[PDB]
């Protein structure tokens, strides 16, 4: 047969939020445990705490979702990304898409009010 | 024979040997039937595609 890869998970849509809760917490645990591997494999120029901060940020992004099926899809895609990161399939270029903050400051004029954006034609 | 081979050399449109060298080639060949696949220059792709006479009489079928 065609056997699965190292850290594969069969797609199984929970019929309960309480089970998907445990699944999501396990995935969070796995990301946190694997962050040192993400720093060693990808030649990362920043902290392991920074990687865990980013993981927490991306897990907080979808914290107040309540539709169960959307949460199932998000869990499945999160596990896909975990398998893509822990198995060295991504390169540094794709891993550092999550980390635009660590790259140096993009120029001087970054508007946050109206007149700036107007003078730059972004209002 | 069968309907699909073998066929002699002189019925193959390829450039071969002549004289003592053919008498040697048919002595030193695993299969004298076999050909050296150089097309006969007088006959292959002559007249050239851009100098065919059939273009002047060609009409739409």
């Amino acid at each position: 047969a065609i056997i699965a890869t190292a850290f594969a998970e069969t797609v199984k849509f929970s019929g309960s939020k309480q089970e998907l809760q445990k699944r999501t917490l396990a995935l969070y645990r796995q990301f946190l445990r694997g962050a040192p591997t993400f720093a060693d494999l990808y030649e990362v120029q920043f902290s392991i705490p920074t990687i865990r901060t980013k993981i927490r940020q991306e897990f907080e992004r979808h914290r107040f979702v309540d539709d169960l099926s959307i949460q199932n899809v998000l869990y499945a895609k999160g596990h896909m990304e975990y398998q893509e990161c822990i198995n060295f399939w991504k390169q540094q270029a794709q891993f550092l898409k999550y980390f635009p903050e660590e790259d140096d400051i993009q120029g001087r004029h970054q508007p946050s009010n109206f007149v700036d954006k107007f003078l730059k034609n972004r209002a | 024979m069968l309907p699909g081979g073998p066929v002699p050399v002189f019925k193959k449109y390829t450039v071969g040997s002549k004289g003592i060298w053919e008498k040697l080639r048919v002595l030193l060949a695993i299969a004298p039937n076999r050909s050296t696949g150089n097309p006969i220059v007088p006959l292959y792709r002559v007249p050239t595609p851009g100098s065919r006479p059939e273009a002047n009489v060609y009409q739409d079928p």
Binding site: A1, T5, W89 | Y13, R34, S35, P49, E54, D60
Partner: protein, 388 residues
């Protein structure tokens, strides 16, 4: 516990004829798990086709399996003709058949003599590529391109044959058999070839079906299936050819199948050069095909139709079709959906290499790495079709 070691066979390396990332896991010499990573030649063909007329979309198929161009455009033309409900003329059918078998000769000359090169035989490659050049000249004389002809279109053929092409094709056919024979003298009865090919890559008939394999991969396991005999499309019902089928499902049987297919393609080319009919090479309905130029420049209806076919395109009836051909790689198919418009709603290409490279994991388990090279070579994997 048997800890496994992961080697990337190589995103860039010789054995892949194209670009492949085969992540193998080994326990010593033996492969235990494989993970072919693809998409490195995914160019979004199937979405681009949704933004193109059926004529604009046809050169997508020349560039999928780029050793067998005319067969890809043949299957797309067959699909669009089945939706359009138009009949290709007899001469166009004979041309498509003759050139489909020339294309089969080209594909097998690439495949067998690259399999040989990857296994170590360097000389058949360079012998066969001259015959490839001789046939590329016929491609260029009929279409104007050595590789991407854009010749077989929906409705038949772009241009009639130029004068003096059948004579030259016959001249090539009088000598191609000895080329095949000289390749066989090196490869067929050889000890090292048989060692590298006999009982390697074995796949059973049942598993060959379950995995979706076709062509030589299915015929080497013993199943006599060929779409040209079971569902003839262009002119294969009007020409005599035999189908090679093998036992033992190995790579040696696939090699023998491909050489028999060389010889049967030569047979078909002979019959088509002898029995080429007269008439038109495209449908005589100027609502589907361009009219001739001397009518487009003298007739008003002809010019209107030229204008519309080259700007808006021909509108295909609504519906859907899956049609397939016996491409030299296997069963190549196109699932088209028509929305009544000039552009497709959906075009999925069933590439024969996708299924075979998916079956690599089942076929190559338990083998050593030198045998994986032979398996990739007998699958005959071009990656434009795998990735599309």
């Amino acid at each position: 516990r048997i800890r496994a070691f992961t080697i990337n066979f190589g995103p860039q390396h010789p054995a892949a004829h194209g670009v492949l990332r085969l992540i193998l896991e080994l326990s010593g010499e033996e492969i235990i798990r494989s993970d072919p990573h693809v998409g490195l030649l995914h160019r979004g063909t199937e979405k681009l086709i949704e933004y193109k007329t059926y004529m604009q979309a046809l050169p997508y198929f020349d560039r999928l399996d780029y050793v067998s161009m005319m067969t890809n455009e043949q299957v797309f033309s067959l699909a669009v003709e089945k939706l359009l409900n138009v009949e290709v003329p007899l001469r166009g059918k004979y041309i498509r058949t003759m050139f489909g078998e020339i294309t089969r000769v080209l594909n097998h000359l690439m495949s067998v003599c690259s399999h040989a090169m990857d296994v170590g035989a360097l000389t058949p490659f360079l012998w066969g590529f001259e015959e490839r050049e001789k046939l590329m000249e016929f491609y260029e004389r009929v279409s104007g391109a050595r590789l991407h002809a854009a010749y077989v279109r929906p409705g038949g053929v772009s241009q009639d044959l130029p004068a003096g092409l059948l004579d030259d094709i016959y001249m090539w056919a009088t000598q191609f058999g000895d080329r095949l024979d000289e390749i066989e003298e090196l490869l067929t009865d050889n000890r090292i070839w048989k060692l590298r090919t006999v009982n390697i890559g074995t796949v059973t008939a049942q598993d060959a079906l379950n995995l979706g394999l076709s062509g030589p991969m299915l015929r080497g396991s013993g199943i006599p299936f060929d779409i040209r005999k079971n569902a003839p499309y262009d002119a294969y019902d009007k020409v005599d050819f035999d189908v090679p089928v093998g036992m033992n499902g190995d790579c040696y049987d696939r090699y023998l199948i491909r050489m028999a297919e060389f010889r049967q393609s030569l047979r078909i080319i002979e019959q088509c050069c002898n029995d080429m009919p007269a008439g038109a090479v495209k449908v005589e309905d100027f609502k589907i095909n361009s009219p001739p130029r001397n009518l487009m420049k003298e007739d008003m209806e002809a010019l209107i139709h030229h204008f519309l076919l080259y700007t808006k395109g021909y509108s295909v009836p609504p519906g859907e079709t899956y049609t397939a051909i016996e491409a030299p790689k296997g069963e190549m198919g196109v699932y088209v959906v028509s929305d009544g418009s000039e552009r497709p709603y959906k075009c999925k290409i069933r590439a024969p290499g996708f299924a075979h490279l998916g079956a690599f994991d089942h076929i190559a388990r338990g083998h050593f790495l030198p045998d994986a090279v032979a398996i990739i070579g007998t699958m005959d994997l071009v990656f434009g079709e795998v990735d599309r």
